[PDB]
């Protein structure tokens, strides 16, 4: 027996992955992520899922590619992405993970759906 | 050559995916309590059946095997509504599938 543990967080930099900072990626950090980060429902998503504190031994048994806004935040500040599509995929992974692991109607799903609808509003104005 | 790649690489990669478990065997609609499943899904398909077909010289060519893969994905998108958890799992599996077959020899 023992205490269940959290896996290491996802990487926020990589010397082998090409770096870039386009105006869309700037917009994703200073507008899109900025709006979601300050939302009232943002707190469960600003850091990797803490399965230990949440007493969720099955979470990382189900989710093998976790994602959070704190990882996304560091990736944007580090110019981790080459384009906006790569960053948008990290957002969708975060949402999809929450929708697969939790039931429709759950509080965490209601909060994730609210953040996603706001996310879709901002990326609809992604600049040229 | 291409049928070897689908059995040795493509299926092996998808079978080890985190969201592969609902698609590794035929849908037992009775055990899973899905009474309308086979009324709606006329041609069920799964990676376990594709494995048996790839091992037993079933497919005429690699394109027939790819059709069975797409049928498996299409079935999920037909039976479950968009945004369902199982649908999202199928889309993740499908995206990896399209990436692995895009490098077909």
């Amino acid at each position: 027996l023992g205490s269940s543990t959290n896996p290491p967080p996802p990487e926020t930099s990589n010397p082998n992955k090409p770096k870039r900072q386009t105006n869309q990626l700037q917009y994703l950090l200073r507008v899109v992520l900025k709006t979601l980060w300050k939302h009232q429902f943002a707190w469960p998503f600003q850091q990797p899922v803490d399965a230990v504190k949440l007493n969720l031994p099955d979470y990382y048994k189900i989710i093998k590619t976790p994602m959070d806004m704190g990882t996304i935040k560091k990736r944007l500040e580090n110019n981790y992405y080459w384009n906006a599509q790569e960053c948008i995929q990290d957002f969708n992974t975060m949402f999809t993970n929450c929708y697969i692991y939790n039931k429709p109607g759950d509080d965490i799903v209601l909060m994730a759906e609210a953040l996603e609808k706001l996310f879709l509003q901002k990326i609809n104005e992604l600049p040229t | 050559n291409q049928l070897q790649y689908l059995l040795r690489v493509v299926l092996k990669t998808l079978w080890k995916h985190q969201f592969a478990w609902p698609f590794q065997q035929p849908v037992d609609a009775v055990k899973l309590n899905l009474p309308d499943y086979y009324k709606i899904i006329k041609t069920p398909m799964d990676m376990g059946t594709i494995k048996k077909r790839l091992e037993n010289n079933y497919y005429w060519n690699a394109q027939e095997c790819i059709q069975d893969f797409n049928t498996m994905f299409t079935n999920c998108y037909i039976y479950n509504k968009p945004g369902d958890d199982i649908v999202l799992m199928a889309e993740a599996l499908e995206k990896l599938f399209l990436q692995k077959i895009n490098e077909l020899p």
Binding site: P44, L54, N55, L56, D58, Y59, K61, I62, I100, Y101, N102, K103, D106, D107, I108 | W21, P22, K31, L32, D85, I86, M89
Partner: peptide, 14 residues
């Protein structure tokens, strides 16, 4: 609790 295709786990709701 959530069940997907013969597999069950605890959600954040529980």
């Amino acid at each position: 609790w959530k069940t997907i295709k013969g597999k069950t786990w605890r959600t954040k709701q529980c």
